[PDB]
């Protein structure tokens, strides 16, 4: 028995996608609802839109854009060409917004159902789709990210804690540089890290939820995962005890590094995926490592939360669309019998109302 379930959803090459376009600059997956791929047939650039609830019928439309990102929940698409940004409601066949920047945008994404984040060489902006909103500057970039490839931007639920992540080669290894910004304090902190996420977590005995920041890193001296509360705890709350635990890289994977993290608030577990296709599962409360294995031979370059299972969905270099989630009927007996950790098994059973700790 395994504590996780693997599932193949699609092979993109079977939907007519050219394998040269399956990669970070041309394929976007902003949620589990859609995948968008930019392709060029002759001199005509186009976008292919795959509805994940009807994937055998993809739509190809002509474009003149260098990047395209679909809204997480709706057929509303953002396109850009250098400094020109445009937003379309596809079913309405209408241009809902247009804005001209004064810098090129090196990375962008949807950070909520209604707000786009825009990263330039110098700063980070938020752009709300509500009313007549224009972009607002959130913070200036820190010099520690100068010259990095920007690979992600994330926030907490309330958009008060903001995190930008870049990577580069230093001393023949892939080095991660993050910038954590506090909206209320107006202060940045540089942190060495590769992949991260925020989470809401309600501790035993507390009336309010805690806001947690979890980040993984491969440093000079090996891999580490950190779980720490950000900000002042709500009035009356016990503070969350911070944890730091090892992240294992085998001796044969000298160049591998963390590329993605999703946290399940249903199960309170952390899913961590590496560049070269290794999955790790950790308990969010204690930081205990539950499981590790290689699940892809091809590299993984994009992920999102998988809503149906509360897991993680991803796309590899070949075009396999794959997901991993907690196997609810096996996780408790696995932790008891394979990990031989009855303490964790009992906790996770009662905490998330799972079966299998009746016998320990």
């Amino acid at each position: 028995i395994l504590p996780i379930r693997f599932q193949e959803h699609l092979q993109l090459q079977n939907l007519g996608i050219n394998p040269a376009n399956i990669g970070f600059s041309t394929l976007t997956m902003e949620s589990d609802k859609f995948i968008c791929i930019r392709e060029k047939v002759g001199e005509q650039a186009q976008v292919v839109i795959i509805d994940m609830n009807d994937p055998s019928n993809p739509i190809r439309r002509p474009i003149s854009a260098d990047s395209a990102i679909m809204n997480p929940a709706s057929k509303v698409i953002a396109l850009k060409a250098g400094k020109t940004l445009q937003i379309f409601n596809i079913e309405m066949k209408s241009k809902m917004k247009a804005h001209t920047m004064t810098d090129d945008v090196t990375f962008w994404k949807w950070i909520s159902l209604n707000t786009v984040a825009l990263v330039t060489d110098n700063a980070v902006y938020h752009w709300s789709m509500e009313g007549e909103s224009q972009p607002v500057k959130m913070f200036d970039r820190h010099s520690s990210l100068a010259g990095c490839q920007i690979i992600n931007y994330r926030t907490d639920a309330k958009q008060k804690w903001l995190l930008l992540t870049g990577i580069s080669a230093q001393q023949n290894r892939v080095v991660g540089a993050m910038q954590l910004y506090s909206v209320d304090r107006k202060v940045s902190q540089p942190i060495e890290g590769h992949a991260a996420s925020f989470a809401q977590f309600k501790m035993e005995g507390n009336a309010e939820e805690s806001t947690l920041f979890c980040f993984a890193v491969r440093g000079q001296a090996g891999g580490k995962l950190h779980i720490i509360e950000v900000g002042t705890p709500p009035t009356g709350n016990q503070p969350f005890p911070k944890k730091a635990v090892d992240v294992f890289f085998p001796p044969e994977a000298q160049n591998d590094f963390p590329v993605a993290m999703q946290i399940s608030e249903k199960h309170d577990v952390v899913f961590l995926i590496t560049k070269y296709g290794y999955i790790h599962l950790y308990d969010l409360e204690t930081g205990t490592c539950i499981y590790m294995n290689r699940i892809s031979g091809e590299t993984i370059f994009v992920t999102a939360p998988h809503e149906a299972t509360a897991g993680i969905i991803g796309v590899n270099r070949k075009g396999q669309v794959l997901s991993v989630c907690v196997e609810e009927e096996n996780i408790i007996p696995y932790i008891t019998n394979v990990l031989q950790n009855p303490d964790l098994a009992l906790r996770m059973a009662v905490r998330n109302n799972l079966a299998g700790a009746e016998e320990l």
Partner: peptide, 10 residues
């Protein structure tokens, strides 16, 4: 000032 104390010495 720093945002997070990332020395995990108790």
């Amino acid at each position: 000032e720093t945002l997070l104390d990332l020395d995990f010495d108790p």
